[PDB]
């Protein structure tokens, strides 16, 4: 009946120490060994997801990475990218100048590396540690990055980000969307980013229907895929509206909610 499992990372697949438990790992490997295909779907850049995808052997079972909230869709076996929703190049110098003017660090991603002019900013390092990515520091951001980029973050104290966010929101209306993922991360992303939309494209391409999909998540950015999936699963630690929109509520991420759901459902 079900042929695909889509998982968010933080608050879902990973526990409170941001690790994949051995029970989750073994359950997901086994279910792939049974012919079920996995998708990791997360706001993280691709190389923040790659280590977890490698730990789950997804490169051996045709698993997909939906990085940047589905901004990119990559088959982690074949390495083929089927979908690339990136920032318009012309907005990048505007984002840079806004960060500079407001004395805040900007970062973006270039493969396995985070590129920034401020590697000593604790908020930049928070993103590097979260993704397990090395930081490449430059003194000429616009020269040293490789375009196009899927997103940028401006980072800093919440009180300093709110006005920058409020300015960019309208100044680049029509070119980008802006939101805060943590109080100190301002996400600068292309329009039309939604995990559910990217999932629908994936399903069209591999010839599956939404009824054949399980999607598991915890936060508001997982609501659309939980509704879209035939079997939407809310983690025990999920936000109340995610739980109410789900078809099934499992245990928390620290109680191996993902493994428990998969074993019960199958």
- What residues line the site for Mg ion (CB under 5 A)? 8, 10-11, 218-219
CB of residue 63 vs Mg ion: minimum separation in angstroms? 18
The reply, when asked if residue 194 is annotated as ligand binding, is: no
Instruction: Indicate the residue among 10 and 247 with the shorter CB distance to Mg ion.
Output: 10
Backbone angles phi, psi at 108, to 5 degrees: -150, -170
The reply, when asked if residue 222 is annotated as ligand binding, is: yes
CB of residue 14 vs Mg ion: minimum separation in angstroms? 9
Instruction: Indicate the residue among 118 and 131 with the shorter CB distance to Mg ion.
Output: 131
Q: How many C-beta neighbours within 10 Å does residue 123 have?
A: 19
Our CA dihedral for 165, 12, 251, 194, rounded to 10 degrees, sits at 60
Instruction: Indicate the residue among 8 and 121 with the shorter CB distance to Mg ion.
Output: 8
In the bound complex, which residue of the shown chain has the CB atom lying closest to Mg ion? Answer: 11
CB of residue 238 vs Mg ion: minimum separation in angstroms? 9
The reply, when asked if residue 8 is annotated as ligand binding, is: yes
CB of residue 45 vs Mg ion: minimum separation in angstroms? 15
Output the known binding site for Mg(2+). Answer: 8, 10, 218, 222
């Amino acid at each position: 009946k079900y042929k695909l499992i889509v998982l968010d990372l933080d608050g879902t697949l990973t526990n409170s120490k941001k690790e994949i438990s051995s029970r989750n790992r073994e359950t997901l490997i086994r279910i792939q060994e049974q012919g079920i295909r996995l998708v990791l779907a997360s706001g993280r850049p691709t190389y923040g997801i790659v280590p977890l995808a490698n730990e789950l052997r997804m490169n051996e079972f045709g698993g997909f990475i939906l990085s940047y909230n589905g901004g990119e869709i990559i088959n982690w076996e074949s390495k083929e990218m089927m979908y690339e929703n990136v920032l318009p190049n012309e907005v990048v110098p505007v984002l840079y100048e806004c960060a500079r003017t407001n004395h805040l660090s900007i970062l973006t991603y270039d493969g396995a590396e985070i590129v920034t002019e401020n590697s000593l900013d604790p908020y930049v390092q928070k993103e590097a540690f979260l993704n397990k990515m090395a930081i490449r520091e430059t003194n000429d951001f616009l020269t040293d990055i490789t375009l196009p980029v899927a997103k940028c973050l401006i980072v800093g104290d919440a009180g300093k980000l709110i006005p920058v966010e409020s300015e960019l929101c309208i100044r680049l209306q029509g070119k980008i969307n802006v939101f805060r993922s943590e109080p100190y991360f301002l996400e600068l992303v292309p329009q039309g980013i939604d995990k559910a939309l990217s999932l629908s494209v994936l399903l069209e391409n591999i010839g599956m229907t939404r009824e054949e999909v399980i999607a598991i998540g915890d936060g508001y950015n997982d609501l659309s895929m939980i509704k879209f999936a035939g079997m939407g699963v809310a983690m025990g630690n999920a936000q109340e509206p995610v739980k109410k929109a789900a078809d099934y509520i499992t245990l928390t991420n620290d109680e191996d909610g993902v493994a428990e759901a998969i074993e019960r459902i199958f």
